[PDB]
Amino acid sequence: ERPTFYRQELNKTIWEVPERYQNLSPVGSGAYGSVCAAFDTKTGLRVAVKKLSRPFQSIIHAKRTYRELRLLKHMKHENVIGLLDVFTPARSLEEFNDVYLVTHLMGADLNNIVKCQKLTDDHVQFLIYQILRGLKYIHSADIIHRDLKPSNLAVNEDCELKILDFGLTDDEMTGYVATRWYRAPEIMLNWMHYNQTVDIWSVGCIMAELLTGRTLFPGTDHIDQLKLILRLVGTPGAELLKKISSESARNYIQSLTQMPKMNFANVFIGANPLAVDLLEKMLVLDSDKRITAAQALAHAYFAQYHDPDDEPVADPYDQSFESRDLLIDEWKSLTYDEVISFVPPP
Template identity: 55%
Template structure:
């Protein structure tokens, strides 16, 4: 017997899964799927635009999934910047908390991402300029909210046909053990201090900074923690700046700059260009293993980036030199990078807005499943669409 949809909603099967969506969203087509959800493109009849709708995969099957779903919803609700993906709508067909099984997130539909774009064509320097400018504007906004992305890569930078860019993928869980095994591309964009930190499985401290990572709670026993000392030594936002530098380098070169086959190889590839670190950097490392490893490496001098990027302008290379510094404390911030001459053509300083601080009180709490569900339901019910949806949907 067919189950009737709630009034104002209709049911459609997408890849053997029932979707129950409001009548305003039509022409659902699957465009992506992953461990945590499926994304469809749809036509929003009310706004006359194409949107992306994400259905989370069994968001309330466990406490971990429920917390992750709650957190993704809260982060998306918080983001209100044209270079960061935000929420156009959130809905559930259920009208009672005790029946809540699924909910759907509606976001701007962008069309492609930087990874796909770079496979299709070599980018001219003026396009690199415009895309990196937007990426830095997005990072300045995210960082001002007290959020670090931690997994910035070409596939997480969505691009529409007008070359407008949005940073994606907040709050998505990434299993630490899978991520660090050496089979994933994210390694190529990973900051050296993060790799070095993985050499030291210390349980002595938790991230106590006001920065919250968008990489979620992995299996705790398998996750090395930053010690408080390391947090004060390594500016956490600098991990995103390193990734941004790797992405910019790839845009200019047409191929990844550091293509390590595993984590140690990744460090070797990095140091072939940055040179082996000086003693003042080594002394800051918490891990004795990491210190020993770096001290055991043959001394390599720093490479001249101008010769490596001979086809790029000196202004472009200047940006890379300030981002791809081994010592995170010396890397530019997103805000400082925007000041560099390379971006002057596109700069509209008044548009480089900052965010309200993101309240992460709940992110650090351990609640039973039903409470995460209740909090999520409240967030869904209190959602207000952006004042000007055209601006958010680009």
């Protein structure tokens, strides 16, 4: 049956949640909503509860809400943020106006833990292994993160990791900002229709930073960042130039003085040669030629962690809704069906 709900004001907004969730405390901002820590008395888990802000105020918002719920409901993997619960105080579709999403409460994001700090090779191995393990799963469902960065990697005290905010402005991408430093050049500069390996570029940037304690490509703007990238990996050859479908972007790239790829062993001085090799395979300008998550897990760098029988893939994920044009109430009804049909994990 329907649980008993109780009301509380937290972020100058009234939160209405089932009794099972106790000791609500603000954590901060989440994607498209605010997040509270809580204790789930039913499972004994410390949980993060996100209340979506105005989830059905427009078509964009309504579809966005449906999108996030569909994504979270699908993801069932140790290294990916999944859905422990989803609820609404609404008793019917006509009353339906709020959506609350529940997942594991994590200790900190990777950024807050590692900033300015050089990690030991074993710690890097374990962290990157988990990211790749989660990404293999995400990619197998034909989902792309698109925005992978340290702040979207949630980690506990024992370094257990989960990927947050997968599959989801111009101002926040401007200037000397971490929001752009981990982005593949093809997505940063709209070169072409990009693939799953945009995420692998991001993993390369994250891995380098864990190994050195320094941002790999701390560009002051898009152009400065491109220059930093091209200095390391070399200017594109004729082969990649043809794949840049944007005539304007292709034309600009051609104006740059050619540079050869640098020696990664001279860039990452002292690093495990296996780590250097993997970075070389991740940080390839031509996305067609980048290592995949599945391939990277089999790389000798992860010898102590790799297990082909314990690196699962996802069930098929139907995202035909993405190409669908619907009204607010139609997206709302689809979302409502997904809320009501939710079955909690074991």
